[PDB]
Amino acid sequence: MRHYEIVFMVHPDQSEQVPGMIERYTAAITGAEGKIHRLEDWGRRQLAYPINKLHKAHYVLMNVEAPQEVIDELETTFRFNDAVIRSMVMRTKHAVTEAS
Amino acid sequence: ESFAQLFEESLKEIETRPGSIVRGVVVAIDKDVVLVDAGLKSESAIPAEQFKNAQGELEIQVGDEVDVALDAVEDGFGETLLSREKAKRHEAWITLEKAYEDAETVTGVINGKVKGGFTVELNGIRAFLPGSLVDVRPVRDTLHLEGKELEFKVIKLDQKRNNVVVSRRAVIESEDPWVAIAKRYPEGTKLTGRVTNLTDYGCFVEIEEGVEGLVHVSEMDWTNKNIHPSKVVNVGDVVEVMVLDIDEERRRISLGLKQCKANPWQQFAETHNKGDRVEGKIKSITDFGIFIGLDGGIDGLVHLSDISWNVAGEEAVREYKKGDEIAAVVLQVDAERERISLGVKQLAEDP
Amino acid sequence: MKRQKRDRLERAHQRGYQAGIAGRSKEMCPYQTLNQRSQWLGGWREAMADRVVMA
Amino acid sequence: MLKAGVHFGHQTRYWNPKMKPFIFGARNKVHIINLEKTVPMFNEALAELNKIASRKGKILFVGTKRAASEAVKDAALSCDQFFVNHRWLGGMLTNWKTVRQSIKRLKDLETQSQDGTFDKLTKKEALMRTRELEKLENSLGGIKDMGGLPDALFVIDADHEHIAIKEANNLGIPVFAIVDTNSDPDGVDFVIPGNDDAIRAVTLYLGAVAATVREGRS
Amino acid sequence: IKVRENEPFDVALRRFKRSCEKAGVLAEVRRREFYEKPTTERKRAKASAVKRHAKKLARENARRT
Amino acid sequence: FCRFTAEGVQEIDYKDIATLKNYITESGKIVPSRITGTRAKYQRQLARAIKRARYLSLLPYTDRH
RNA sequence: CUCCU
RNA sequence: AAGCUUGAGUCUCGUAGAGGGGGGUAGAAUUCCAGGUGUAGCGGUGAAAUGCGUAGAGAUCUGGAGGAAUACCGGUGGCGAAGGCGGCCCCCUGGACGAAGACUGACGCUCAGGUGCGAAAGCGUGGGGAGCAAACAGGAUUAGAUACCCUGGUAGUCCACGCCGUAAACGAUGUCGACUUGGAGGUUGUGCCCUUGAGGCGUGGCUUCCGGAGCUAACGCGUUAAGUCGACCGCCUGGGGAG
């Protein structure tokens, strides 16, 4: 199907809910016949510039393969959450492995 | 027939592109131009300065054979790049033999480090090496008799950019340029670099493995603006240069060359700047408030109209001294900043 | 009726300085001899700084 | 055959495309002139030189090239022929009616200055009239003994003395030149594809021409 | 721009990088939207670039000096 | 000059900021391809990678944040 | 203002 | 009437791209508002004044709102029939290109009338309005100054839906096809070989400059022709009156 390369950043002092969030989100993708190809969490690292008077966010890389309606509902759930600051969904074409 | 075709591939087989096959016979000498004929299109306009060995006078008469170099063809009319670089390959082969030999033994004599490694000179050429290479241990050749005779034992070579630091005394003991551009960095690491082309604002000395340096016009000497770099240094010559600046973006290492006769000026400020030493100096142009004696290696503007005699204001130096004459003048002040020594002439015997 | 003033050497300087200040970022109206072109360009580059310090 | 001089081929990329019959692109991005076609054209040139020099005709040798300067004087005064090697004056042949009295100034001035008033007026006048003689001497010295219009013109570079060729194609003089790869073989009657800028070559071609002239005079 | 270093510092480095990129973009952006003559001024600038390069290249023959 | 992305077999990813910080200057500005000497395709991929990494705050826009 | 062949 | 494959078209892989429509989001900056510190000027010009400021301005810091455009990359680079299209991401979608084959079999070119698209300004309806800015006011300048310059400032610039249908809408060069010496570059694919090294030799497309013959009244054009020809269309017949 369509490939996606989701990188979403996480508000730092709510980062203990992140292993729950990954389980809910890849549970939601896996509930619609979709694979997954990466899970890479980069941990709490330093922002290059303050996002909402705030440094040092917690980054999650997913890089999933899923259909369009599932990835759209997923992006709306990234919107309607105050824990999630700056999600990002990206291109198709043959999802990949370890990056940093 | 195919005599000529075969003849052509034969002549292809019996030449190569670099300065490898010692083939050009020197067929006319005239100062200051040598000229050969290595089986190429024309005859090289050779400088005389690729062919005098280690004390200044020529070594090769008519018929003599050195290879030159190639891979550059026709700038309008003519053929080569110089045979002296040829020589570099031979030096590389000997160094390889030492590395290859496991070691290379010649003579290396290294008095001091321009940039942290004693300088070693082999035969005609002199090379610069990193600071450790000069001495096996912490012996230091500063206490050794000056410009001493050992050999060179190699300590370190940079393999791309050509810097080789070699081992004096102790006979018993036996993308790519720009990521890690911190080696020659730190403020003033002196380098030995061949200049390439002088662009009337610059000189373009660039040696250290695929980089570009400028030494533009402002330093170059101890005169600023009237200099014209072609007059003052050379074309194609290995010189004194160090970094002074490396810019990570924009890729402009801005080298310098005034880090030399600057010292002579400092010595003049000192040497004769200890107190009030007397100097015998010649005036060059009297500019209605002084006389401008400028003997002693480029020390600029000097004696003021105020002393000149034992009368202050009325004197007008053209009436009282000369044009172009060597006089008594003693120092009275050297100002280290703003480059003003201020000599005088009233220090004499009238009162 | 007497002889020329500063025989093109530091007159070549101030021509390059005036031509440096009044725009002319060509650096392509100099002399052609070396001892005068060198400081036409010398006055030009000494005039770029004096253009930065003012309007 | 590359006989003794090396006349193999030339420059790199700014070849005149009219010389497509003489090319071989080498590995160093340099042309190789077809040496197995050069020799029939050179022999077709020498067979003309024996005819028009056994006519008792006058050959005019032209080449400056900064390197073939002395090879023309040396390799042409060995014959009874005439040369122009330093500066090619605009109109020495088609405006020879007014080059003539400049030759009269040269001959009529060394006649005055070998024995006559070469000291009788001023040291400054010797510095003027002598400097005039060394200005006209390497400008008209080889053409000085000609006294007529030449019957042939042997040009060593068409690209460098192309105005001498058009000069002697306004009037009817059969010019022939050794052309380079970038030269233009249009006004040249008997084109010789070869090396213009080698001292070996301007020894070889000009030497064999020098043999055909003095050996040709019967 | 940002210069902080040890005791010989503070003037030459800063007036270099400051002066170049500062005076460039501010002296550009200070007025004149133009919408039309960056097209003309880049066209004239680059036509002058190729005319200066070829002009110096074929001007590298001789000058009788 | 040399194009290091041509020396590799790469297609520029936006996450190796160790490489992308060789192509931003210290003011955050993208360095020209006449300075770095990259090929034009990897220059476009490079620019999209820089802007994308700026969006994820792995690189700064300017130095005045 | 100083990055060319 | 029956074919044939070179013209034309289709399919399998990729390739690059500010091609278009819709949605969303990011940072810098400008303006305003609230608050803090602070006080005598700010702003502007060729000089000035109108203007703003002791009712606390200009500056500096914190927060917030809103609108618009997307620095660097930026490239006589790219895509589009033309107009034109530059942050970043998603969705829907057009075209071009090349390698190797397969397939159809002249299905082609141009096109009066017609239909469609068509910068900016403008017009209608509804929103929106930061910055800029016709009109307008004021200050200058000037002999005068319904102007250039300055201080302000409304339509408009922006969005959604309709209209208008013109531009120095320009390459001042209709479209399609064939042929005819070269060089230096850009960009984008691809083949072979020692990728053994940013290497060498070819091959297609698009594009920039310089020049050859040839052409032109000259200027200049010059394989992307204004060279040699062919098919079809549009248009011209002294200047003004008069588009």
User: For the residues of B295-349, what is the DSSP string, one character each?
Assistant: -STT-----BTTSSSS--SS--HHHHS-SS-EE--B-S-EETGGGEE--BS--SS
Short-list B91, B90, B86, CA closest to B44: B86
* CA B245 distance to own-chain centroid: 19
What amino acid occupies position B198?
A: L
State the Cα–Cα distance between residues B113 and B130, nearest whole angstrom.
8
State the Cα–Cα distance between residues C29 and C31, nearest whole angstrom.
7
- The residue of chain F nearest to residue A61, with distances taken between CA atoms, is F15
State the Cα–Cα distance between residues F19 and F39, nearest whole angstrom.
16
Residue B157 bridge partners (DSSP): B164
* CA B17 distance to own-chain centroid: 29
Helix (H) or strand (E) holding F32: none
State the Cα–Cα distance between residues F16 and F37, nearest whole angstrom.
19
Q: Is residue A20 part of a domain?
A: yes
Length in residues, chain C: 55
Concatenating the DSSP letter of every residue in B37-106 gives -SSSSS---EESSSS--SSSS----TT-EE----S---SSS-----HHHHHHHHHHHHHHHHHHHSS--S
Short-list D67, D77, D48, D88, CA closest to D202: D67
Q: CA geometry: angle at A77 spanning A75 and A79, to 5°? A: 75
CB within 8 Å of B125: residues ≥ 6 apart:
B87, B88, B91
Q: Is residue A87 part of a domain?
A: yes
What is the CA A90 to C1' H69 distance in angstroms? 25
CA end-to-end distance (rounded Å), chain F = 33
Please report residues of C whose CB lies closer than 8 A to that of E63.
Answer: 32
3-class state of residue B304 by DSSP = strand
Count the neighbouring beta carbons within 10 Å of the beta carbon of residue A2: 14
* CA B215 distance to own-chain centroid: 12
State the Cα–Cα distance between residues B94 and B100, nearest whole angstrom.
9
F interface with A, Cβ–Cβ < 8 A, is 13, 15-16, 52, 54-61, 65
Short-list D154, D127, D166, CA closest to D71: D154
Touching chains, F (3+ CB pairs < 8 A): A, B, E
What is the CA E33 to C1' H152 distance in angstroms? 21
What amino acid occupies position B107?
A: T
Report whether B137 belongs to an annotated binding site.
yes
Strands D152-155 and B24-25: unpaired
Q: Which two tokens stand for residue B84?
A: 């002296």
State the Cα–Cα distance between residues D71 and D88, nearest whole angstrom.
16
What amino acid occupies position D76?
A: A
Report whether B140 belongs to an annotated binding site.
yes
Q: How many CB pairs under 8 A join C and E?
A: 6
Q: Which two tokens stand for residue B184?
A: 């020659």
3-class state of residue C32 by DSSP = coil
Contact with chain B for residue D198, Cβ under 8 A: yes
What amino acid occupies position F24?
A: I
| Cβ-contact B292, B275 below 8 angstroms | no
Touching chains, E (3+ CB pairs < 8 A): C, F
| Cβ-contact D10, D19 below 8 angstroms | no
Cβ distance of B249 and F35 shorter than 8 Å: yes
| Cβ-contact F5, F12 below 8 angstroms | yes
- The residue of chain F nearest to residue E3, with distances taken between CA atoms, is F26
State the Cα–Cα distance between residues B152 and B103, nearest whole angstrom.
10
Strands D82-84 and D59-62: parallel
**8-state DSSP, B252:** -
Total domain count for chain A? 1
Dihedral sign for Cα B18, B21, B23, B24, please: positive
Q: Is residue A99 part of a domain?
A: no
Length in residues, chain E: 65
Count the neighbouring beta carbons within 10 Å of the beta carbon of residue A86: 17
Give whole-number Cα distances, B189 to A7, B185, B233, B258, in Å. Answer: 45, 7, 21, 14
What amino acid occupies position B284?
A: S
Domain span at A14: 1-92
Chain B nearest-CA distance from F39, in A, is: 13
Helix (H) or strand (E) holding B194: strand B193-194
Residue B342 bridge partners (DSSP): none
Touching chains, B (3+ CB pairs < 8 A): C, D, F
Closest nucleotide C1' to the C-alpha of B175: H198
Helix, strand, coil in percent for chain F, rounding step 5:
45, 5, 55
Mutate which: C37, C52, C54, vs E, most E CBs within 10 A:
C52
Segment 63-92 of chain B within 8 Å of chain D by CB: 70-71, 73-74, 77-78
| Cβ-contact A95, A63 below 8 angstroms | yes
The pair phi, psi for residue D189, each rounded to 5°, is -75, -55
3-class state of residue B319 by DSSP = helix
Contact with chain E for residue C52, Cβ under 8 A: yes
Task: To the nearest 10°, report the CA torsion of D85, D88, D89, D95.
Answer: 100
CA end-to-end distance (rounded Å), chain B = 101
Q: Which two tokens stand for residue F63?
A: 């130095």
Q: Which two tokens stand for residue E14?
A: 């800063």
**8-state DSSP, B133:** G
3-class state of residue B248 by DSSP = coil
| Cβ-contact A88, A3 below 8 angstroms | no
Report the b/e string of B146-156 with b at 16+ CB within 10 A.
eeeebbbbbbe
Residue position matching structure tokens 């090879």: D71
The pair phi, psi for residue B269, each rounded to 5°, is -65, -40
Q: Which technique was used to obtain these atomic coordinates? A: cryo-EM
Q: Is residue A100 part of a domain?
A: no
State the resolution, in angstroms: 3.0
The pair phi, psi for residue A46, each rounded to 5°, is -90, 125
Q: Which two tokens stand for residue B172?
A: 């018993």
| Cβ-contact D15, D29 below 8 angstroms | no
With touching defined as 3 or more inter-chain CB pairs under 8 Å, the answer for chains B and F is: yes
What amino acid occupies position B164?
A: V
Q: Which two tokens stand for residue D101?
A: 């009295």
State the Cα–Cα distance between residues B226 and C9, nearest whole angstrom.
8
Residue B120 bridge partners (DSSP): B127
DSSP H helical segments within chain D, as ranges? Answer: 35-53, 69-77, 96-113, 123-140, 162-170, 199-214
In strand H, the nucleotides that come within 7 Å of a protein beta carbon are 16-18, 25-29, 62-63, 71-77, 87-92, 132, 181-184, 186-189, 198, 200-202, 208-210
Short-list B279, B295, B272, CA closest to B329: B279
In strand G, the nucleotides that come within 7 Å of a protein beta carbon are 1-5
Please report residues of B whose CB lies closer than 8 A to that of C13.
Answer: 225-226
